[model samples]
Target chain A: SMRMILMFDMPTDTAEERKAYRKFRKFLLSEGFIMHQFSIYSKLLLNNTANNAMIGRLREHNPNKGNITLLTVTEKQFARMIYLHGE
Target chain B: GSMRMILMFDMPTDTAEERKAYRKFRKFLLSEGFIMHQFSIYSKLLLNNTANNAMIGRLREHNPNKGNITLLTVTEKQFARMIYLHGE
Candidate 1:
């Protein structure tokens, strides 16, 4: 039930910054992460051990200059997400 | 990269049009070999990076552009270690 969410925001104004952001995004996707939101990714690890190892792996690829957040929630909490859409 | 991949998406069910679109897109996903991992989350096991990208490209092509898509990949061993919590 320990689900992990990774979110980040990086400057995209400059070409280098854009490249950095894209590279990081691609890396996350390649690592089996799915976007929970535009800049947010989610994954389910086997357990705390797997989650810790994954956090370390994520840190290794994290860009030097960006706001990144890692959050963990129980399966029940994640399942409580609600989606509301209107015309 | 010979990695196992999972693709997930959720669509709006607010309107009849949207629901129809969701069904069609969902049908496409199933037709393309994606299996239901959850209510709206679909996954597929790919042979390698090339196959993974190819499947991704196919999804993009048929995309109704009405929802969000997430793609994740892992090693075969990692996928095998997956655990499921009761009522999850």
Candidate 2:
């Protein structure tokens, strides 16, 4: 795998929740994660072994209130994604 | 094992009728605990295969007929392994 697909939903409606959101995002940025979209992030992992090492860092850094899901796919699987929208 | 369900769709919003359907479908997903993956993709975590099956069944209840919606499921561990990799 060449990248990691990390997505999450953090509430910011209240002061504590918003503070939690900022710190968690800061956690990712400080650790070199790239923003993929709103609430989605990614990072290059040279190989499976490297991916295996990232789990602990991710779990320790994430917010407790919201949910987070991490995924890794081959380059071709990422290419399978389709995108579009209109207002 | 923990599972996650991804929902991707492409609906035209060229007109009022089309946009309403799209909005309705979007609303349903949000209310159902699915998190937005991007502009067109949404996903939710399931505790087990039974939860996953229930979601697959619940899906047919509110689908926008104009375009296509694709559903895919994967284990949390398998996903943890996809570190394999979109936009606003």
Best by TM-score: 1
What's the chain B TM-score of candidate 2? Answer: 0.79
Any runs in candidate 2 off by more than 4 Å, and if so which?
A46-49, A79-87, B1-88
For all the predictions, what are the DockQ values?
A: 0.04, 0.07
- lDDT string for model 2 (A1-87, tens) is 555666655544467866887887888888788875546677776465765666666677666555566666556655544322233
- Fnat value of model 1: 0.00
Residue B39 in model 2: lDDT: 58
The TM-score of predicted model 2 comes to 0.49
Q: In candidate 1, what are the lDDT values of residues A23-73, reduced to their tens digit? A: 888888998888766566778754768766766666777765654554455
For model 1, how many clashes?
Answer: 2
Scanning candidate 1 chain A in windows of ten residues, the lowest lDDT window is A78-87
Best by DockQ: 2
